[PDB]
Design a protein around this motif. Sequence first.
Motif: not given
Lengths: 78, 166
Positions: B12-16
Amino acid sequence: ESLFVRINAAHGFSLIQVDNTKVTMKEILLKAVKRRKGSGPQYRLEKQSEPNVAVDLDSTLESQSAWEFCLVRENSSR
Amino acid sequence: MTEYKLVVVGAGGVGKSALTIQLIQNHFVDEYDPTIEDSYRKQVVIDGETCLLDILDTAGQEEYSAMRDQYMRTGEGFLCVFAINNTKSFEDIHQYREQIKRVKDSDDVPMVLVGNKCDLAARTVESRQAQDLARSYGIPYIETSAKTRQGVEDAFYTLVREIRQH
Ligand SMILES: Nc1nc2c(ncn2[C@@H]2O[C@H](COP(=O)(O)OP(=O)(O)NP(=O)(O)O)[C@@H](O)[C@H]2O)c(=O)[nH]1
Ligand SMILES: [Mg+2]
């Protein structure tokens, strides 16, 4: 998992989180358009099982008895 | 025309989502709206040959992990994304690869290791560590920024090239 609605659009689908079925279809449409189209062309939602009929955006998700909808440009068809 | 089913996975939150939207729409998403699942289809030209990208943007939130099975079975190439300022997201990469193995019986699928948010000055995942992980998997490592667009086309287009060269 949260409850969510499937929105089928011109170039893919979006799963739209909903807190409950008292959410209005207007709220769902606004979320789907903002995610998929960004920031004017107008849109309707249709029940998956009833093509070419716009759902009442002021009605609740519960009233639709449906969990899949098509997002359609108002000058177009699904 | 030919369609390629590409899948963007990672914590979550890594920028996918930001990576996907920067590719499809040439726009940086500043807001953090957690994904359940979304797909986006776009016609592109890669090495002079037109094709249709079908990008599946997936949930990093572990509460939607059950969904992985379906999309890992039919996914034809995977961006395994971590954020260069999130060591946990780097630790999490292996889990995705293992799940892709339980349904494909191998990891014999085009994959790219993507180190996103490289516009940020503060890095906690070393470049050599990410390079070594990718080498241990036999896959490329590409540094990206969904914000500046750095590396974004390279990441997605590398998957298409790998499929074409099977
Ligand atoms: N500086 C910078 N910020 C980024 C980059 N990519 C994403 N972000 C930011 O990080 C936050 C989360 O991005 P998002 O794309 O929603 O991440 P996600 O992996 O899709 N999260 P989820 O798994 O919940 O769907 C957003 O505020 C976004 O602006 C990047 O390359 N650089
Ligand atoms: Mg997302």
